[PDB]
Design a binder for this molecule. Structure first.
Ligand code: MN
Lengths: 165, 544
């Protein structure tokens, strides 16, 4: 339960290109810090470097919507890699089941554009239904927006813990 | 002859629900409905053409261009779908391209012959969007940039896509998901802080940070009050008055008709010459530098003076604060003299004695050295040779484009045989040939765009199956099923009953799916029916 050493093990696996194992230990460190993601993970543990490493681990495993979810963990939301990852079609993750963990309206706008351009209308309807949510309104009061982001963050990281532990 | 172009944001971020339960696109369409409801109240607004542009791809972006009836505009507005990205810059470029498409063929934009406030094609672009960041396939652009990849012919002569008589307004819908009103909405409409605000400001318009339905109604009402004919002027301050907001102001100067009339163009920002293969690019808003100095508004008889009432602006606020109704402030333009760069005073801003309005009075290029001279000629009655050499001396300090209107005016006073009757145009033949080429190309591309607005092209219905060519079709509604002519359209569960039906139908012995618009039409139904023998709270409930 030493998150510093868990991050060290995750990075050791990350350098050797064991991306599944690296993700395992990053999520283990996060679950040490926040009590199984019940609280916010401290920024001095899930730093932008750690989150970027997690992004690379998810991308190299073809879990592209998971890359899109992790892209809004960063202090400055990285839309370039998020949009690049969502363009991929060889996904090995649940895809449309993860659209409930996206709280950024820009990511969902791009998802709706992508599913409309590529012709999948039902997934496009799922993304539109996700945008058309009261708690998702970008013009909401701030404390509502962090609460939506925090609950989606908790659910997403717990789902990843279930998948990767 | 106004034009009302609506740049409806159709990015998928417009699918955000407000507390009303309707998406931002639904309130956007409703705001368009409210706008035409309010605009139609003015009985001088009867003659008015609406256009529609969206954020889609260029063939599909325009949905109501020129020569499209109001019914098509309504039908296209009702059926919009928010499914694209926030390509706001590209949509603004195509919106301005739509408006400035016909400018060259009819020559409203007089290039090198002066800027004519009386030659204008008024229009305003209302872009209803949200505050969401701009998006392209690459990423988030985070700043409004207007693409310049495929310039329209003649776009190099204006240097800015937006024209003299075009203004941009924005309805940035900030309606929150949860009901969060307060007394803060009771105050006036705020400005926005998004990327559409600076481009709105430089066009002479403004944005509207709307956050509530009542302030949406206020914003729409103010927008109806701002649909006015005229041209915008980038007023600049020169010299000290006896930071300030009058130092730089884009304000509207209204144009009144009775086909508006007028004679004196605003001077160009270059000295014309006959040895320039290419014309300089004039700015969209002609900078005028007013000298903060008291001056007399002297007026003479039988000569064209053009009055242009200003929009209520901080310039007018300054004028009323320093209430000096019987004096005037001189205005001039830089780069309008061969022997000087400061130019010469061609007009003056004189406050009305009642202090109701401030009006621009455009005169010939150097009016204090023509008006006494011409008034002397008209009061001294033959002309004198001293007057002739003085007239020639004026022509040395005079750009060529004023000569035509001055000769026209002098003809109107009743002395066509005066010295200015020689006539010319003072511009390069290369420029004139380039202008005819621009007119031809503008006409051809105008025809091409007007044809493309109807959208005779269509989208495919494939998936392009990969090999991790062949494609699986998508469902297409209103594809006209041929069930009675094609057995493949018959569902298996509905096979026997359909078989019985079309068996009976083939013998001696789908329908009722009319569109809802033509469903309660009793005028149309009775028109297609024979006549009988002749005799001896809410808004509507049908059949009046
Ligand atoms: Mn009825």
């Amino acid at each position: 339960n030493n998150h510093s050493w868990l991050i060290i093990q995750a990075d050791i696996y990350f350098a050797t290109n064991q991306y599944s194992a690296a993700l395992h230990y990053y999520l283990q460190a996060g679950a040490v810090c926040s009590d199984f993601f019940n609280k916010a993970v401290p920024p001095d543990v899930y730093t932008d470097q750690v989150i970027k490493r997690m992004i690379k681990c998810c991308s190299l495993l073809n879990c592209h919507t998971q890359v899109a979810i992790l892209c809004q963990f960063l202090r400055e939301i990285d839309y370039k890699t998020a949009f690049k990852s969502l363009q991929e079609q060889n996904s090995h993750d649940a895809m449309d089941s993860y659209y409930d963990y996206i709280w950024d309206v820009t990511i969902l706008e791009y998802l709706t554009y992508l599913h409309h351009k590529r012709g999948e209308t039902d997934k496009r309807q799922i993304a539109i239904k996700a945008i058309g949510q009261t708690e998702l309104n970008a013009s909401n009061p701030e404390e509502v927006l962090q609460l939506a982001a925090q609950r989606r963050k908790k659910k997403f990281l717990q789902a990843m813990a279930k998948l990767y532990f | 002859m106004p034009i009302l172009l609506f740049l409806i944001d159709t990015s998928a971020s417009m699918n955000q629900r407000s507390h009303l339960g309707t998406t931002y696109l639904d309130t956007a369409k409703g705001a368009v409905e409210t706008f035409m409801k309010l605009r139609a109240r003015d009985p001088a607004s009867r003659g008015d053409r609406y256009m529609l542009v969206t954020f889609e791809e260029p063939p599909y972006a325009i949905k109501a261009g020129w020569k499209e009836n109001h019914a098509t505009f309504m039908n296209e507005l009702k059926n919009l779908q928010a499914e694209g990205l926030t390509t706001l810059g590209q949509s603004l470029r195509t919106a301005f391209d739509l408006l400035n498409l016909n400018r060259l063929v009819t020559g409203i934009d007089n290039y090198g012959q002066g800027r004519n406030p009386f030659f204008l094609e008024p229009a305003i672009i209302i872009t209803i969007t949200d505050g969401s960041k701009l998006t392209t396939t690459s990423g988030v652009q985070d700043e409004l940039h207007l693409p310049l990849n495929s310039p329209l012919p003649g776009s190099e002569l204006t240097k800015e896509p937006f024209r003299w008589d075009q203004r941009l307004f924005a309805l940035v819908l900030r309606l929150p998901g949860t009901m969060s009103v307060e007394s803060e909405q009771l105050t006036g409409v705020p400005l926005d802080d998004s990327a559409i605000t600076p481009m709105c400001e430089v066009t002479g318009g403004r944005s509207y940070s709307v956050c509530s339905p009542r302030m949406l109604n206020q914003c729409l009402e103010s927008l109806v009050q701002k649909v006015q004919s005229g041209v915008v002027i980038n007023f600049e301050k020169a010299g000290p008055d006896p930071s300030q907001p009058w130092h730089s102001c884009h304000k509207l100067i209204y144009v009144r008709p009775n086909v508006p009339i007028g004679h004196w163009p605003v001077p160009e920002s270059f000295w014309p010459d006959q040895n320039s293969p290419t014309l300089p690019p004039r700015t969209s808003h002609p900078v005028v530098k007013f000298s903060c100095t008291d001056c007399e508004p002297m007026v003479i008889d039988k000569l064209p003076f053009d009055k242009y009432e200003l929009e209520p602006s901080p310039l007018t606020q300054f004028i009323l604060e320093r209430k000096s109704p019987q004096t005037c402030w001189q205005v001039y333009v830089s780069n309008s003299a061969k022997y000087s760069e400061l130019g010469h005073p061609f007009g003056y801003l004189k406050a009305s004695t009642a202090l109701n309005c401030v009006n621009l009075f455009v005169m010939p290029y150097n009016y204090p050295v023509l008006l006494p001279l011409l008034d002397d000629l008209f009061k001294v009655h033959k002309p004198t040779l001293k007057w002739r050499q003085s007239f020639e001396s004026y022509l040395k300090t005079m750009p060529p484009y004023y000569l035509g209107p001055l000769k026209k005016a002098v003809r109107m006073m009743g002395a066509p045989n005066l010295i200015a009757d020689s006539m010319e145009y003072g511009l390069s033949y290369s420029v004139i040939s380039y202008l005819k080429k621009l007119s031809q190309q503008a006409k051809i591309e105008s025809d091409r765009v007007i044809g493309s607005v109807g959208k005779k092209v269509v989208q495919e219905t494939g998936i392009k199956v990969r090999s991790r060519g062949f494609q699986v079709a998508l469902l297409n509604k209103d594809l006209k099923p041929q069930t009675f002519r094609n057995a493949y359209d018959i569902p298996r569960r509905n096979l026997l009953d359909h078989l019985t039906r079309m068996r009976s139908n083939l013998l001696k012995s789908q329908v009722h799916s009319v569109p809802i618009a033509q469903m309660g039409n009793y005028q149309e139904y009775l028109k297609q029916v024979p006549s009988p023998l002749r005799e001896l709270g809410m808004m509507i409930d049908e059949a009046d």
